[PDB]
Design a protein around this ligand. Structure first.
Ligand SMILES: Nc1ccn([C@@H]2C[C@@H](O)[C@H](COP(=O)(O)OP(=O)(O)OP(=O)(O)O)O2)c(=O)n1
Ligand SMILES: OC[C@H]1O[C@@](CO)(O[C@H]2O[C@H](CO)[C@@H](O)[C@H](O)[C@H]2O)[C@@H](O)[C@@H]1O
Ligand SMILES: [Ca+2]
Ligand SMILES: [N+]
Lengths: 415, 553
DNA sequence: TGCCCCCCCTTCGGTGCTTTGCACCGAAGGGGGGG
C-alpha cells in the first residue's frame, strides 16, 4: 500500500544499453541462486527482448566476507537518471564526518527492497544473466522494487530513513550519520568499545523496523588519522650533475602548482657541458634558491577549495615496490588532496589487485570528505584492467574511470 | 485466428509510420516458385490475405536453401527495421564443443518452420504487408500480412529465441539430470542415462514442443553419431570441425585472399600453428576486390606451412571439470602467437592464435600479455574459469618487466616452459648515470613550413655533431639526435634529451616498431652494454641542452 | 537479393597530448562461421 515515486530520465537521453560481460562459474552460480530467490519474493521479474535496455551485472565478496553479494553496474543508468538534487531529495554532506576518530560503514541496501519502484521506470533497470559456454541464451530480468546500487534508491528511501534514525539521532546527538548509495557512514569520537557498542545498537535498531551482504557487517575507518603526501625535495650535501638536472626538472614541473619557485640560480650551475656523475658544489645564490623553494612547498597552494558543482578527478601513479601515489583535484594543478599507499594487499605480486584496492581507498576517502565519487585516470591498459578488476572488487559502488599512459619522466610525487 | 503461444508486444519508434517501398521487378522463374509457397502459409494459418485497408508494403524475393531443393522466402524489411523499436538480443555468444562435457547419450533436433510457429504481435501485423506479382504485373495480385515471425525482420530472431526458452524452461527445471544447448531452432540434448530412458525423455520433449505448436521432423532428427552440430562433428570421446575447403586457385584476387584468411582463422580453433601474417599482409592497400595480387615468397611459404597442418585430421577432446585447465603459448615470430588449451597432455580441448598488432611500438612481453588476456576471456566464456599458463618467458624476465613498467600489469598463476624461442627483454636502461661514460646532450628541431631541420649532440669530452635533415618533423629530429648519440658512442653512454616524445617510446623497451627510425634505435640499444637516459626541460639554460638547442635551431 | 550473434584483418576518421605531428581507438567493411 505504498505509492510509487515517479522517476524520469534526463531529457534527450535514452536508457542504458550496455552489454553483459562474461562471468566466471562461481559468479554465475551465485547470481542464479540469488535471482531465483529474488523472483520468488517478487523483487525482480523475467522480461523479454522487447525491452531494449540492459545493464551489466556480476557478484562480489566484501572484505572478510564468505557469502556472495549481487552487484549491478548502474553507472550508465545513474548518469542518465535525473539528479535528485533538483527534486530536493539530495542528501547534504556533513563536514564533520571526516573529523571523527572512527567511522563505520554499514551496508543498508537490503532495506531498499521493501519500497516498490515506478512502473514506467522499471524497464530501465533491466539486466541479463549469461550462461557458461552459452548453453542458455540470456535470461533477462527487471526490478520491481528499489534496486541496490542505483542512485535513486537512497533518495526515495531517505524520507523513510530519517524516521528510522530519529530515535537514535536524538539519544546520541554527537554522532554523525551520512548515507551514500547502499552504505551508511556512522562516525563518533567515543572509545572504540563504546563506538562499536553504539554501532551494534544501530543494527538492532534497524531490526525493529525490519520486523515492522546483510546488516551484520561493518568496516572501521579513522579519518582523523588520514595524512597527505606533499612534494618533497631530497636533502643531499654533494650533488652530481644528474642530481641537479632531476631537481631542476622537478622544480620546473612543480612551478605549475607553486608559481613562486625559481630555478634561475640553479640552472646556471648547469652552464657547462659536464659529465652526469660529476659532483658540483652549490653557489651562494643557489643555496638561497633551494631553501626558499622548500619553504614555498610547505605553505599551501593559494586558491584551492572544493567546488560542489565540479566533478572530482583522481590520478594514480605506480611507483613500484608496492608504492602508489594519488592526487584528487577538480581543476588541474589545484589539488584538493594528495596521498600515498604502500604495503596494500597484493603488494610485490599483483599490480591490478593493488590498483583495485587503491581505487576503493580513494573513493572511500572522497565519500567521507566530499560525498562524491571521483573519476579515475588509471595507469593501466584498457584490456588489462577490464579482464581482472572484477576479481578484486570489494565495494558496493563503482566509480567512473578512464585509462592513461604517462611515462614518469620526472619522479614528482615519490623520490 | 488460433492462438499458439504467449505473444511479445512490439512497437514502432515514436512518430514513425510503417514502410512503403513497393516492389522491384522480379524474374519469372522466381515469381512462379513464390506463389506456391504463399498458398501453403495461408492453409496453415501463418498469413492472412485481407489487406485493402493496408497502405504499407515491403519488397519480397527468394533464394534457395543451402544445398537443398527448397526455395527460401525473404522480405526486405530494411525500411521496417529502421522504423521498428530496438530489441536487446538474448544471443550473447556461440557455444563451443570444447566446453561440452562427455555424455553417454546424445540427441540433436531441428524445429520445423520455427519463425512461422510463433504468433506475431497482433497490432504489428499490418506493417508486414507485402505484394507479389501475379503474372508479370498484368493483374493486380495477392497482398498479404504476416501472422507469425517473418524471415527478414530484425525482431524475428530475438523474439523466437526468447519464446523458445520460455517453453523449455519448465522441461529443464523438472529434469535437472539433462543438459540442453539451445541455439535458434537447433537443439542439443545430452545425458548419462541409458539410451532407452534417453529416447523416452527425447520423445517427452518432442511432445512438449508439440504442446506449444513446435514440430520436430525426423528428417532433421539426429540419433546416431557423428552429430553435425554448429559446423562440427561430435563423436562420443572426441570432436572435430567439419572438413574445410581451401581454394587452390592459381590467380589470386583480393576477394580470394579474404576468403583464404577467413578460413584459416576458422581452422585455427583446433589446427595448431596456423599463421596468416604474410597472407593478410598482401591485403593491406586500397586495392579493389577484383585486383589480382601475386603471392610473395614469404606468403607462399606461409600458405605451404598451413597446407601441411591441414593434411592430417586433428580432433579435440571434451571438458573435464575435475581437472585443471592448462594454456600453453608459443611465439611464432613477427608478432604471431599460437596457444593450446588442454587438461591432459597432447589431448587439446581447443587451440587458437593471437596476431593482433596494437600500437606503433611494442615488444614481445606486451604481446604475450595481450595473448594471455585473450585466452583468459576465451576460457571464462567457454568454461567459466582461468587456465594455468605455461609461458616461454622466464620468471626473472617477467619479474623485471612488471616491477619496472610504469603501467599496472599482471599475469595469472603461470609457470615457465623452456620452449624456444624464449621471450626476453633485449635491453635495459640504467636507473642511475654511468660513471666514466661519455655524456651526450642531444636535441633536434625542424621548420614547420619547410619541413627541413637539424639534429645533433654535444658531449662533455668536446665531441659535437650536427646533421641537416630534409622532409622531417620536430619529433623525427628528436629521435634522430638520440640515434646519432648511440651510433657515435661507446658501449656505455649517458644521453640527455628534452624530447618527451622520444623518451616515452624508448623507456617502454620496444623490440619492434612501425617506424624505420625507431627500429634502428632499437638495434643500437641491443648492441650497447649500459645506456642511461635523462630528461631536462627545454629553454632553461641547462647543461649542453641550451648549447645543442642553439646548434639545431 | 532479408534478419540476428560470435571471431580476425585492414582502413579511416575522430580525439587528445607526444601537439599541429603522432599515437590510440572504435566503427566499418572484407572474410570465416552459426541458425
Ligand atoms: N538464412 C536463414 C537461416 C536461418 N534463419 C532462421 C533460423 C531459424 O530460427 C529459422 C529457420 O526456420 P526453419 O524452421 O524453416 O529452418 P530450416 O530452414 O532448417 O527448416 P526446416 O528444417 O524446418 O525444414 O530462421 C533465417 O532467418 N535465415
Ligand atoms: O571499464 C570501462 C568499460 O566499461 C563499460 C561497460 O561496462 O562502461 C562502463 O564504464 C564506463 C567508464 O566508467 C562508464 O562510463 C559506463 O557508464 C559503464 O557502463 C564500457 O563502456 C567501457 O569499455
Ligand atoms: Ca528448421
Ligand atoms: N627548439
Amino acid at each position: 500500500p505504498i505509492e510509487t515515486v515517479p522517476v524520469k530520465l534526463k531529457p534527450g537521453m535514452d536508457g542504458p544499453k550496455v552489454k553483459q560481460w562474461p562471468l566466471t562459474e562461481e559468479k554465475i552460480k551465485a547470481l542464479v541462486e540469488i535471482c531465483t530467490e529474488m523472483e520468488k519474493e517478487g523483487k525482480i521479474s523475467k522480461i523479454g527482448p522487447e525491452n531494449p535496455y540492459n545493464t551489466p551485472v556480476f557478484a562480489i565478496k566484501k572484505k572478510d566476507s564468505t557469502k556472495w553479494r549481487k552487484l549491478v553496474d548502474f553507472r550508465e543508468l545513474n548518469k542518465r537518471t535525473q539528479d535528485f538534487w533538483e527534486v530536493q531529495l539530495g542528501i547534504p554532506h556533513p563536514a564533520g564526518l571526516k573529523k571523527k576518530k572512527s567511522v563505520t560503514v554499514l551496508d543498508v541496501g537490503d532495506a531498499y527492497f521493501s519500497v516498490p519502484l515506478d512502473e514506467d521506470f522499471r524497464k530501465y533497470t533491466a539486466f541479463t544473466i549469461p550462461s557458461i559456454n552459452n548453453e542458455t541464451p540470456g535470461i533477462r530480468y527487471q526490478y520491481n522494487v528499489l534496486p541496490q546500487g542505483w542512485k535513486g534508491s537512497p533518495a526515495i528511501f531517505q524520507s523513510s530513513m530519517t524516521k528510522i534514525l530519529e530515535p537514535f539521532k536524538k539519544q546520541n546527538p554527537d554522532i554523525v550519520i551520512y548515507q551514500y548509495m547502499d552504505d551508511l557512514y556512522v562516525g563518533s569520537d567515543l572509545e572504540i568499545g563504546q563506538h562499536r557498542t553504539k554501532i551494534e545498537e544501530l543494527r538492532q535498531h534497524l531490526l525493529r523496523w525490519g520486523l515492522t551482504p546483510f546488516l551484520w557487517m561493518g568496516y572501521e575507518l579513522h579519518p582523523d588519522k588520514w595524512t597527505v603526501q606533499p612534494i618533497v625535495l631530497p636533502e643531499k650535501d654533494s650533488w652530481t650533475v644528474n642530481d641537479i638536472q632531476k631537481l631542476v626538472g622537478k622544480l620546473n614541473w612543480a612551478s605549475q602548482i607553486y608559481p613562486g619557485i625559481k630555478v634561475r640560480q640553479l640552472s646556471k650551475l648547469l652552464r657547462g657541458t659536464k659529465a652526469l656523475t660529476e659532483v658540483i658544489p652549490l653557489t651562494e645564490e643557489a643555496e638561497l634558491e633551494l631553501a626558499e623553494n622548500r619553504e614555498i612547498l610547505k605553505e599551501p597552494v593559494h586558491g584551492v577549495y572544493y567546488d560542489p558543482s565540479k566533478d572530482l578527478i583522481a590520478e594514480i601513479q605506480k611507483q613500484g615496490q608496492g608504492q602508489w601515489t594519488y592526487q584528487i583535484y577538480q581543476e588541474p594543478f589545484k589539488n584538493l588532496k594528495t596521498g600515498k599507499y604502500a604495503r596494500m594487499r597484493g603488494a610485490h605480486t599483483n599490480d591490478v589487485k593493488q590498483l583495485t584496492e587503491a581505487v576503493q581507498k580513494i573513493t572511500t576517502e572522497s565519500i567521507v570528505i566530499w560525498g562524491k565519487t571521483p573519476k579515475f585516470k588509471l595507469p593501466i591498459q584498457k584490456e588489462t584492467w577490464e579482464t581482472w578488476w572484477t576479481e578484486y572488487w570489494q565495494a558496493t559502488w563503482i566509480p567512473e574511470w578512464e585509462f592513461v599512459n604517462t611515462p614518469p619522466l620526472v619522479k614528482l610525487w615519490y623520490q | 485466428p488460433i492462438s499458439p503461444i504467449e505473444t511479445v508486444p512490439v512497437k514502432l519508434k515514436p512518430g514513425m509510420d510503417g514502410p512503403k517501398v513497393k516492389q522491384w521487378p522480379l524474374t519469372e522463374e522466381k515469381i512462379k516458385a513464390l506463389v506456391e509457397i504463399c498458398t501453403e502459409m495461408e492453409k496453415e494459418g501463418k498469413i492472412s490475405k485481407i489487406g485493402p485497408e493496408n497502405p504499407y508494403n515491403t519488397p519480397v524475393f527468394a533464394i534457395k536453401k543451402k544445398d537443398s531443393t527448397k526455395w527460401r522466402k525473404l522480405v526486405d524489411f530494411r525500411e521496417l527495421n529502421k522504423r521498428t523499436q530496438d530489441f536487446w538480443e538474448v544471443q550473447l555468444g556461440i557455444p563451443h564443443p570444447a566446453g561440452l562435457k562427455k555424455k553417454k547419450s546424445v540427441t540433436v533436433l531441428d524445429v520445423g518452420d520455427a519463425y512461422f510457429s510463433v504468433p506475431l504481435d497482433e497490432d504489428f501485423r499490418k506493417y508486414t504487408a507485402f505484394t507479389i506479382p501475379s503474372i508479370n504485373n498484368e493483374t493486380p495480385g495477392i497482398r498479404y500480412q504476416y501472422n507469425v515471425l517473418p524471415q527478414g525482420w530484425k525482431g524475428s530472431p530475438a523474439i523466437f529465441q526468447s519464446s523458445m526458452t520460455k517453453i523449455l524452461e519448465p522441461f529443464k527445471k523438472q529434469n535437472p539430470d539433462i543438459v540442453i544447448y539451445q541455439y535458434m531452432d537447433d537443439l542439443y540434448v545430452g545425458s548419462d542415462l541409458e539410451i532407452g530412458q534417453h529416447r523416452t525423455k527425447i520423445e517427452e520433449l518432442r511432445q512438449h514442443l508439440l504442446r506449444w505448436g513446435l514440430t520436430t521432423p525426423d528428417k532433421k532428427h539426429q540419433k546416431e553419431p557423428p552429430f553435425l552440430w554448429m559446423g562440427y562433428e561430435l563423436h562420443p570421446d572426441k570432436w572435430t570441425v567439419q572438413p574445410i575447403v581451401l581454394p587452390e586457385k592459381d590467380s589470386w584476387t583480393v576477394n580470394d585472399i579474404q576468403k583464404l584468411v577467413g578460413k584459416l582463422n576458422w581452422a585455427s580453433q583446433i589446427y595448431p600453428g596456423i599463421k596468416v601474417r604474410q597472407l593478410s599482409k598482401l591485403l593491406r592497400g586500397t586495392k579493389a576486390l577484383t585486383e589480382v595480387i601475386p603471392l610473395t615468397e614469404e606468403a607462399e611459404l606461409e600458405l605451404a606451412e598451413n597446407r601441411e597442418i591441414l593434411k592430417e585430421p586433428v580432433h579435440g577432446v571434451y571438458y573435464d571439470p575435475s581437472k585443471d585447465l592448462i594454456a600453453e603459448i608459443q611465439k611464432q615470430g613477427q608478432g604471431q602467437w599460437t596457444y593450446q588449451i588442454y587438461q591432459e597432455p597432447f589431448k587439446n580441448l581447443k587451440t587458437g592464435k593471437y596476431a593482433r598488432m596494437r600500437g606503433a611500438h611494442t615488444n614481445d612481453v606486451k604481446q604475450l600479455t595481450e595473448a594471455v588476456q585473450k585466452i583468459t576471456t576465451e576460457s571464462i566464456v567457454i568454461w567459466g574459469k582461468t587456465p594455468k599458463f605455461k609461458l616461454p618467458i622466464q620468471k626473472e624476465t617477467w619479474e623485471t618487466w612488471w616491477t619496472e613498467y610504469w603501467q599496472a600489469t599482471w599475469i595469472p598463476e603461470w609457470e615457465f616452459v623452456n620452449t624456444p624461442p624464449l621471450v626476453k627483454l633485449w635491453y635495459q636502461l640504467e636507473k642511475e648515470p654511468i660513471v666514466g661514460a661519455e655524456t651526450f646532450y642531444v636535441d633536434g628541431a625542424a621548420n614547420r613550413e619547410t619541413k627541413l631541420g637539424k639534429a645533433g649532440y654535444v658531449t662533455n669530452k668536446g665531441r659535437q655533431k650536427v646533421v641537416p635533415l630534409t622532409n622531417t618533423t620536430n619529433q623525427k629530429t628528436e629521435l634522430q639526435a638520440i640515434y646519432l648519440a648511440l651510433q657515435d658512442s661507446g658501449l656505455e653512454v649517458n644521453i640527455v634529451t628534452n624530447s618527451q616524445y622520444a623518451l616515452g617510446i624508448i623507456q617502454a623497451q620496444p623490440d619492434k616498431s612501425e617506424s624505420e627510425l625507431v627500429n634502428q634505435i632499437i638495434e643500437q640499444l641491443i648492441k650497447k652494454e649500459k645506456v642511461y637516459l635523462a630528461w631536462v626541460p627545454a629553454h632553461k639554460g641547462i647543461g649542453g641542452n641550451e648549447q645543442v638547442d642553439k646548434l639545431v635551431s
